[model samples]
Target: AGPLIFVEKTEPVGYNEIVNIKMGDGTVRRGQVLDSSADIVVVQVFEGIFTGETLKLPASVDLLGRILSGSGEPRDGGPRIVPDQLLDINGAAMNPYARLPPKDFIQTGISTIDGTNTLVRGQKLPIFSASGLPHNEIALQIARQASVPGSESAFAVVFAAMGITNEEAQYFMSDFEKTGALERAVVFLNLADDPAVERIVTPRMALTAAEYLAYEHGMHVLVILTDITNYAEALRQMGAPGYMYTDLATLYERAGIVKGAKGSVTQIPILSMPPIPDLSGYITEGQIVVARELHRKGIYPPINVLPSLSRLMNSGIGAGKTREDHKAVSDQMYAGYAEGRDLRGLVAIVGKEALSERDTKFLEFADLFEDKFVRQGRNENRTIEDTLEIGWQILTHLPENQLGRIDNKYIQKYHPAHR
Candidate 1:
């Protein structure tokens, strides 16, 4: 039921072989062989609007700084570019044996992402957001400012948008229209008016382009797939329920580093959830949850630390990497904020003045944390040093007894009292 077509062919057909079906109008459709039998073969078609008769690209960095429609056709008013190398849109599955875990850090310039939910190269991190909120702003901001902390190797952004409004597309176009001239971003826009079935193929094209950039050219690529909710719905209507989990895994699992490879692919998939249960939690490393409660209180890009995490956080931080105190600062801030949040409920029932001094201090700590730590300027780029320094600044306001997560060694070195 998932992107399938039954074909009657007794001729020898190889598994996963590319199939071209010529329509009555002489238009050719493409699919890959899935199951072969004596009477019929099951094939999964690439459901998109692009002419799949020939899909090839020049194997060069010149491919960057361009905008293309959902089907990989350049829409930047440029002449038809020459193609020298051909590619199969159905990318080769990555061998787990060749996969090396992502440990390097990527600084998003946003304190919430860099200092707390750290994103490393080759890790698949998703943003769980709501439709009405400003999730797109956060996503684009990341695409604009993300970078490797120490490495001088070239990095590129592969942004794939699905089912966004034309109005939004205009904003995206303006943002990257000049960026295209700078040769940093490769954008694939699948507008809301585009065919729903076409939504299924957009990210695949984006990933394939990213794979070429990363593995072939050795440029660390960050692929941002905005509005995956649209992709899932299009897939759902493609007549898929039992196939959803596996299909999503195929997409989410594609971001990785092949052993001995020169470069890597890291993914930031954005999906707005409305009580959706079919999405997988384990496929991606961890999630960055955008909390509405913080938003209601005037926090821009309000990310809730308690419900968010980075599974490979330890791999990227410690000692010379981020800072010796990075982990301790993160833990202390998380725990402190959590205690402050829990105190809010208790305050709702009991009068604020009636609470003990410890309770009042914690209650104030929550507000202090939200205003100073969680809330950040839209364009302010906070370095790890800045983030850690500010983190310590706020912990000083709390009692030394409350800092349970920080090691005694760090407390002596970084704690304000010790200082």
Candidate 2:
């Protein structure tokens, strides 16, 4: 009912040996012995189970060589595992020498995703969600919808569902499986029923598998990690509790184009905020947010037009890639929305029709912009040019003086022509 006796001291053994460890609940899970020196053998418990007290050895557990792949799947699709070629597991320190600056585009089919908030290859993008939002749907959509240009056939997905439920897990697997994307994708699922400690290794294991497939097999890979807050909570459960800013940085650093490596890896992390602050800021490239007001107005996805931003948007939206008018339209739209939000407060005090002529015009433009320009119907995907054109058309309803951020040439070229 307790730990097995440590009968004897053994010599150092290489990886792939099977060992046994006693658990807290008087049950034992098979552990793949990683490193062994006369006294101790560090092992990875295959079932991710642990028992109450000390871990005892010299017990019965099968040692299967080349047994589990990095993604925790049985190894068969790839080459034999080279146990001796071990990479240093500093785990937290990001080796700058091994990094490549992220520069290519990752196209998300959604117009707001592709145009306003672009995801660049090798960049770390996070999504900020509130409790009742459809972040899961958005995450699943991207998993099925995103692809790299020219590498469509050679691209794969590495998806990690951390702290999800049975229903969510089923939905995720089904969504990808139905689209035929699951075959090319590797999934690391740590459900709500799983022990909290297991979440710590889910993303890392997922990323490791992704690195193997991408760099080793020359495949472009996208890594989607959902509900990182749950993983962080798992870290909290491990007694290393703070805001976990360091752990987040480590997670982001895991995703990028490795220097001198032929293939690339990109990440999209999703986390919802607990109801404490009106604003949440962390160390991430940028965030996409759902707009509660837009939802109240009957908009689906309800992407908060103001706070949602893609930090990598600039890399793919200039003249050659997207459009010359792209930058100006985006800026003008943002400025206009900000102005309109301020005026709405004024209108509440003075009443809608009682506002000044200029205030009234601004309010109308803002209302129309949010409804017509920003709010696209469900399943509609727009190219960058099309989204920018729509933004310009909405801006044409406003006075010329209001387009302060737009250049004169852009105004002349893209300003909606009088019809």
Candidate 3:
């Protein structure tokens, strides 16, 4: 009897149908019909190897501004919810014709995000972080600070945390409560010790709630699913096939602005990359790479902007969105910092004294860039204007000719020499 039980029955049972098994000890167990043949049916239970009748919970949505477990039951000590409508939690595939291209920007107050790799609305931007790095802190900060620029109140956060420890869960919950983000947030938590089968349903349940809040209620929703590595491991433990890139696309593609609906769903799925440096790339519109080396040096966010790329960064920045010179300024900063980072290795080998005048300036600019642009107080929230202004301030260390990536018009308008 493990998790599966075979019952001989004359009636034909449908595949994937819900069933209930009644035990001799007066207890009920829930299971799903895995296999059904002419005379035998196989069922898989969430737990318990004993024979019992199964029960079906047609989980539905009505959980806006509420916290629930992976099974779609109340976990926040809230009252049981009545079914609004029976939804197919295994949501249907999105039609290609119905897909709207992702545009506009979501402002997460962190400068590294807003200024460099902009979080475009309807985009799937994942954070690639490693263990012991402050990825959770960054996620919490985003949840607290993320908003629609002109329509702040219309935005909501759906936080789905899978396979996290109790302490981690408590940290997220208390942080949300203390920061006042709980009011507009819907949290779904699947603990590490929880049943492995529940992990499979956690993300689906969270997305279902997100869909309800977005397409149904016309609210902009940001869904943050953290430690998806654990979710994958849980799937492996249950004898399920490894989650492939296509499976990831199925979930990621759910984030978008629906036509005729005045709302959108943006996603940020944080995954801890394996210790090996070569094992860290995935399918995402953008990635924010967290650095453990920078964290050791006391950097607040420690996001290594050089390695990060937002494929849709241009669509969300420049002109009326952020500023006219955003793209150019971002380009110049990237070029300048990349050169500066390269010079540091040379300086260690040949000494700074042997460097040319231009090389010396770049080396110094790099240090200032890390201190000013890359590093910030944990509580500090910099506006887009402020971030651009800081960029110009750091660029002033290098001569105007060194800023080849920036246009002449932007140089005259935003450059510190002109200002």
Candidate 4:
């Protein structure tokens, strides 16, 4: 059996191991030990190997520029990598006392992500997005733009994906290579459409690479799971919910900043919070929710600001950190947008002009916020200063008294009319 071999007299071996089969003349080929029992072991010879099948990937800087399928095999038809050291795909991370707080900024380079919901370094910020919402494109942009600005640290992207159409996958890799983000990336694809079995293990392979890359190689890694739905759907069928949270927690615990390490792993797992519900958000830092309504209205990122909050956002912004005006400006932007958005409901009932002066201005203020602030294009990279600049510009639509979240001093300094 070339592809599936049964060695009856074999010694005891665990699951997912890349067993090197060397015949008499030293002709050797690799086979993954899929099932090991009392008497014999079943090895799948041809296909790529992953976790639970006794799998481990070559760990080294050479893993960059490589494309791996299933767990971590060379899907790009390249030669096998000579690893520095073989490491198991499963490993937990960080002692609580030695773990540093994930308080620094990792600029997402999207206006909505940076300005509205700041994703701090070494944090898992789940992107709340729905089905068929240009999510593939959104994922591409973040992978291209995500970076940390401190200590001349190197940022590497480890992209892991599961069960998707071929075109979408091509788009991701194609655009990524064009932008040069592909050079430092290690991609794990679980998608030869292996439904349930392979989905659960793909993340482990990607993260294992991220961990070794960061902690060992001094890389600041950003790990992206194309969608949590693939993993959760498999979880529903396999070990199921009773095992979901703790299993996922082990995944998240691997995500954080360990003190004295130049490397860190930040997760931006793309999917909504509902499938797994409460506990998934429990361990992660915060969420960046994509709104369907805003998307329908032609906003690219379409961030639903009301519900989105970067829990660690405060730690990353201030006078010396970002800007002294950030808090007041962010507050005013939130407040003004909310009132303006709320008025749309009333406008349907009371008609356009059947309201107060600020009501009209509030609607204008909110509409413009969506138009400019929330709608940064695929190529448009906006900074925190850029976000606040536009927020002040939109707040100008409201009369002086309509502003409350921002202080009068900020108003006097930044407000166009006051300035």
| TM per prediction | 0.84, 0.72, 0.82, 0.82
Q: If the candidates were sorted by their lDDT against the true structure, best first, what order would they fall in?
A: 1, 3, 4, 2
Error of 2 at 392 (Å): 2.5
**Candidate 4 lDDT (Cα, whole model)?**
0.71
Candidate 4 lDDT, 262-301, residue by residue in tens: 6678887877434444445433578777888888888888
Clashing pairs for model 3 are 19-54, 20-53, 20-54, 20-55, 21-52, 21-53, 21-54, 22-52, 22-53
What are the lDDT scores of the predictions, listed in order? 0.75, 0.62, 0.73, 0.71
- Tell me the tens digit of each residue's lDDT in model 2 across 85-125: 22222132124224666666677766567766778777777
Q: Which portions of model 2 miss their true places by more than 4 Å? A: 1-71, 74-98, 150-154, 239-245, 275-282
| Number of the top-ranking candidate, with TM-score as the measure | 1
Clashes found in each candidate (C-alpha, N, C closer than 3 A): 0, 6, 9, 7
lDDT: which candidate is best?
1
The ten-residue window of minimal lDDT in model 1 covers 49-58
Superposed by TM-score, candidate 3 places the C-alpha of residue 81 at a distance from the truth, in angstroms, of 2.1
What is the lDDT, from 0 to 100, of the residue 144 in candidate 3? 78
lDDT of 4 at 206: 84
